[PDB]
Structure 1
């Protein structure tokens, strides 16, 4: 189990670690988070008590380095940093553990929620979407725009998701205009899967990462990406049967985890009704359709 120690907590802040959230008061004796499961990516995120505007956070993998958080009073935010001195890092984390200055990651041995939300998410792919190569962790916040949003502004601070556009020359073969627009299998299977993502695991990884940035940061461009990647599958008549079964599981856990009170803003009525009730795959997402109909029957 790994640890994200904190130099201090000088400003009052809600801290979130994956699907969990807790409050820290200004100058409270808080020195970080312990017992973090090894083997998964994680995200540690922040909303200041005095300006709930800008949620921000860091995607990281404790296998890739020793990381800690220190508030920066000039830039006004909690920053993730890397300590190369392993000896020094362990010596400090031990002092905090002895003084019980850390809160415990609460993993409960029946719960696979976080695994099920991050199964295909890999830190190497996150770092290609979020370009900042000098760090091993990746910063994301509420306001960051996507490369496609910048096409429809700072390129360095963008989310480089894979561009999906159904009315584009890439999506449409000359001479198959109607066929390719009404059945997107070519675009999914040959252009995206074989050509760009290489396998369905990398596709699902980007889809999962997009959902989580939308949920944790209210990142609008990520929400658009999440829905586009769903709609591409649902609008394809020919999809590997294992991809459909896996998609049903992915979406089930995403819908299960979503705050009920955010459903209005994080779920696109048009995409979901099309996918569950009109699309080629309308009968293929049994788990997802059942949870959607029992939890958000308004949207449908």
Structure 2
């Protein structure tokens, strides 16, 4: 069990750690988060009390280094930092655990929610979507735009998700126009799975990461990307049976975890009604269709 310690909490902020969150008061004696489960990526995120504008945060994996947070009063945010000195950082942390100044990652033993939301998400792929190669962890916020968004403006601060476009030469074989537009299996299986992602785990990882950025940061381009990757599967007549079964589980847990009061902005009516009721896979997402119908029957 690993620890994301803090230098101090100089400004009042709501701190999120994965799907949990807690309020810290200005200058409250707070020195971090302990008992973080090893084996999963994590995200630690922030919303200042003064400026609910800009949710921001950091994706990280404690196996990859020792990470600590210090508030920067010039740039005005809580920054993640890595410490090479394994011995100095530990002595500072034990000291703090002794004084009980850390909150405990509050995982219920029965609960597999985080695993289920991050099953295929790996840090190495996060770091290729979020390009900042000098750090082991990745910053994301509400305002960052995607590569595809910048084609329709700072390339350094973009989310380099895989571009999906249903009316594009990549998506449509010359002479198969109607066939490929109405049945996207070619584009799913050959172009994206075999060609770009290599396997369905990497596809699902990007899909899960897009959802999490949409949910935790209100990142609109991430939300677009999540829906596009869902729609590409649902609009394919030919999908491996194991991918459909896993997609149903993935979406079920995303829909289960979504805040009930964010469903209006985070869910695209057209995509979901097409996917659950009109598409090739309308009958293949039993768990997802059942939770959607009992929790968000208005959208549909």
Give the TM-score normalised by the residue count of structure 2.
1.00
- In the TM superposition, residue 33 of structure 1 has moved relative to its aligned partner by 0.1
Aligned pairs (5 A) from 1:63-74? 63-74=63-74
The CA deviation string for residues 142-180 of structure 1, in whole angstroms up to 9 with x for no partner, is 000000000001000000000000000000000000000
Runs of 4+ in 1 over 6 A off after TM superposition: none
Separation in 1 of the partners of 2:76 and 2:106? 29
The CA deviation string for residues 107-129 of structure 1, in whole angstroms up to 9 with x for no partner, is 11100000000000000000000
- In the TM superposition, residue 27 of structure 1 has moved relative to its aligned partner by 0.1
- In the TM superposition, residue 261 of structure 1 has moved relative to its aligned partner by 0.1
| Secondary structure, counterpart of 2:239 in structure 1 | coil
- In the TM superposition, residue 296 of structure 1 has moved relative to its aligned partner by 0.1
Separation in 1 of the partners of 2:87 and 2:229? 44
- In the TM superposition, residue 31 of structure 1 has moved relative to its aligned partner by 0.2
Gaps of 5+ in 1: none
Gaps of 5+ in 2: none
The CA deviation string for residues 68-99 of structure 1, in whole angstroms up to 9 with x for no partner, is 00000000000000110000111111001000
- In the TM superposition, residue 55 of structure 1 has moved relative to its aligned partner by 0.2
Separation in 1 of the partners of 2:185 and 2:51? 45
- In the TM superposition, residue 8 of structure 1 has moved relative to its aligned partner by 0.2
- In the TM superposition, residue 207 of structure 1 has moved relative to its aligned partner by 0.0
The CA deviation string for residues 13-65 of structure 1, in whole angstroms up to 9 with x for no partner, is 00000011100000000000000000000000000000000000000000000
- In the TM superposition, residue 218 of structure 1 has moved relative to its aligned partner by 0.0
| Secondary structure, counterpart of 1:149 in structure 2 | helix
Separation in 2 of the partners of 1:157 and 1:142? 12
Separation in 2 of the partners of 1:247 and 1:103? 34
Separation in 1 of the partners of 2:172 and 2:253? 32
- In the TM superposition, residue 12 of structure 1 has moved relative to its aligned partner by 0.2
Separation in 2 of the partners of 1:241 and 1:89? 48
Separation in 2 of the partners of 1:88 and 1:35? 20
Separation in 2 of the partners of 1:293 and 1:278? 15
Q: Aligned residue for 2:271?
A: 271
- In the TM superposition, residue 183 of structure 1 has moved relative to its aligned partner by 0.2
Matched, 1:148 2:148: yes
| Secondary structure, counterpart of 2:246 in structure 1 | helix
Separation in 2 of the partners of 1:179 and 1:263? 33
Matched, 1:15 2:15: yes
